[PDB]
Structure formats: structure tokens, C-alpha cells
């Protein structure tokens, strides 16, 4: 009990510093401490009850600065603190957590599209590089299932991708997996039960409402019910057995919609609206602030 969906940063006209938290139990939103630096294209994750904001870019009227930053938010204090920075700036990053370590995957730095991957150790406040992916990927979806790390889709600098790959930590090795049925950059990627889900994104032509899921045992991708809204650069998380998608861009509007997927019924429902439309947010779940 007492867990909230946190949304950090984002983009609307410029990169945003907002930290807002939604309570699925009562529908309430709270505005919390702003990020020290506005960022879009970042990822959020939680280790040990602390919320981490990783990477991104500060788009402002006075510049565009890709971020190598790792910042941690403590809900007990409602304060952000800087952590050790990554080896490189990574905009449109993907992040996953394995056994208390944060993996930062891909992303861009100017015209560079990274294949590099690095791993954060909160106990030592240190980053170290690990094996790079087989493909350069920005706007990559990342999720962790059964202590394996998946990198899904993205953009390699020339083509948007339907390919995906899996990292095996004990061998420090990446292997390709079955590609998705759809090309997707800027999808929301998460894990629910035994599947990796890829929701929305941009196929090079249109923003997508389709959603597909990879069963790690059968190695197949299967479509599920589509979202109500086409969305790229959406936020995504899982909470109490349901997927939540937040915001994004539908080709016309920066969305304030939040939709919830129920796997038992294979349906999406609109559950709330953010306080303003935005894309490129980082999202994660942790305890409510004190």
C-alpha cells in the first residue's frame, strides 16, 4: 500500500522540471520538488525506495544540452540530490534495474547514436561501462524480466528499428531476440507477468496506438488491444498488475491522457489526466512522500 506513480520532467514547448505523483487509489495528483535541471527524454527508476532520474536533454530557449546526470529524489525529504554522472550524455535513454544496479542504455549525444551501456552501483556511487549493444539505439525501450535486460526498438541514426536484443549479465553479452512486428522508436516498454510489452512509438510515418508483447518462453511477439490514443515518447510503468501509459505526442497534441491496461480483460481505460500535456517523461513507482 501507499505507492504512487511518479512522473519526472518531460517536454512541452521546452524541457520541463516537473515532478508530479499520481495516487491510483484516490485519483489525486501531488506536485513535488522540481528537478534541479529541466530535462526531457530521461528515464526514471527506483532502487531502495529512492527515485532516480537518468540522462535526457535540457531543451531551452538558450540551448540544448544533453545530460549525463543521475539525480536521486528521496520521498522522505522531498529533496533531489546529485549522484555520480554517467560516462557520456544520453538523451532519449532507456534504463533498467537488475539486482539493485541501474543500467543506462543507448541514447544520443548530438549526432552520436550510442550503442554503449553502463551500470550504476548505488552503494559505491559509481558507474562502469559494460558490453555495448549489437545496435546503436536512441529512443530505445528497456525492461528487465527474470534478471535479463531487454533493449527494444529505437533509432540507429539511419533507420527506426523493429529489432530487439537481450543482455545476459553473467556473460556480459548481448544477443538478438525475435524482432517485433512493428518498427517502433520512442515506444513505452515495460514488463508484466512473463512478457515484455512495447506500446506505441513512431514507425517513421505515424504515431502508433498498437501494443505488442514478447513472451520470453515462446520467443514470439503478439499484438494485444491497442491504446485509445496514438502516442510516441510516452511514459510507461506497471503498478498492481496493470500497465499505465502517460502522455506522449499523438501527431497533433501533447497528450495529458493516462491510460491503464488490464491484461485479464485485454482492455485499456482512461484513468486520469496529467496536470498538463507533455511528452518524454520519466516514470517510476515508489512510496508516497512524507
Ligand X SMILES: O=C(O)C[C@H](c1ccc2c(c1)OCCO2)c1ccc2ccc(OCC(=O)NC3CCCCC3)cc2c1
Task: Give me the residues that bind ligand X (CB under 6 A), please.
Answer: 11, 40-41, 92, 139, 155, 160, 185-186, 202, 232-233, 249, 279-280
C-beta of 41 vs 75, nearer to ligand X: 41
C-beta of 64 vs 269, nearer to ligand X: 64
Q: How far is the CB of 255 from ligand X (least distance, A)?
A: 11
C-beta of 75 vs 139, nearer to ligand X: 139
C-beta of 24 vs 246, nearer to ligand X: 246
Classify residue 115 as exposed, middle or buried by CB count within 10 Å of its CB (0-12, 13-18, 19+): middle
d(CA 137, CA 102): 18
d(CA 7, CA 176): 31
C-beta of 68 vs 185, nearer to ligand X: 185
Which residues have a Cβ under 8 Å from the Cβ of 41 and sit 6 or more positions away? 11, 55, 56, 57, 91, 92, 93, 107, 233, 280
Q: How far is the CB of 201 from ligand X (least distance, A)?
A: 7
Q: How far is the CB of 251 from ligand X (least distance, A)?
A: 7
Q: How far is the CB of 268 from ligand X (least distance, A)?
A: 21
CA-nearest of 117, 166, 156, 154 to 136 is 156
Length in residues, the chain: 290
Q: How far is the CB of 13 from ligand X (least distance, A)?
A: 10
- Planar angle of CA 166, 172, 178, nearest 5 degrees: 15
Q: How far is CA 53 from CA 66, 229, 271, in A?
A: 14, 26, 25
Amino acid at each position: 500500500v501507499g505507492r504512487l506513480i511518479y512522473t519526472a520532467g518531460g517536454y512541452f514547448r521546452q524541457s520541463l522540471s516537473y515532478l508530479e505523483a499520481y495516487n491510483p487509489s484516490n485519483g489525486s495528483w501531488l506536485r513535488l520538488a522540481d528537478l534541479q535541471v529541466p530535462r526531457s527524454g530521461l528515464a526514471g527508476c527506483v532502487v531502495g525506495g529512492l527515485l532516480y532520474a537518468v540522462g535526457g536533454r535540457n531543451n531551452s530557449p538558450d540551448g540544448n544540452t544533453d545530460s549525463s546526470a543521475l539525480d536521486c529524489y528521496n520521498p522522505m525529504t522531498n529533496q533531489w540530490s546529485p549522484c555520480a554522472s554517467m560516462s557520456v550524455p544520453r538523451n532519449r535513454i532507456g534504463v533498467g534495474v537488475i539486482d539493485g544496479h541501474i543500467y543506462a542504455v543507448g541514447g544520443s549525444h548530438g549526432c552520436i547514436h550510442h550503442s554503449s551501456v553502463e551500470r550504476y552501483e548505488p552503494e559505491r556511487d559509481e558507474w562502469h561501462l559494460v558490453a555495448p549493444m549489437l545496435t546503436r539505439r536512441i529512443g530505445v525501450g528497456v525492461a528487465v524480466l527474470n534478471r535479463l535486460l531487454y533493449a527494444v526498438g529505437g533509432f540507429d541514426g539511419t533507420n527506426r528499428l523493429n529489432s530487439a536484443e537481450c543482455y545476459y549479465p553473467e556473460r556480459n553479452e548481448w544477443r538478438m531476440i525475435t524482432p517485433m512486428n512493428t518498427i517502433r522508436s520512442g515506444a513505452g516498454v515495460c514488463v508484466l507477468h512473463n512478457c515484455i510489452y512495447a506500446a506505441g512509438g513512431y514507425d517513421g510515418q505515424d504515431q502508433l496506438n498498437s501494443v505488442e508483447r514478447y513472451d520470453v518462453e515462446t520467443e514470439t511477439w503478439t499484438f494485444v488491444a491497442p491504446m485509445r490514443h496514438h502516442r510516441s515518447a510516452l511514459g510507461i510503468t506497471v503498478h498492481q498488475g496493470k500497465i499505465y501509459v502517460l502522455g506522449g505526442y499523438d501527431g497533433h497534441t501533447f497528450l495529458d491522457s493516462v491510460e491503464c491496461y488490464d491484461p485479464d480483460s485485454d482492455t485499456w481505460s482512461e484513468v486520469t489526466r496529467m496536470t498538463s500535456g507533455r511528452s518524454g517523461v520519466g516514470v517510476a513507482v515508489t512510496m508516497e512522500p512524507c
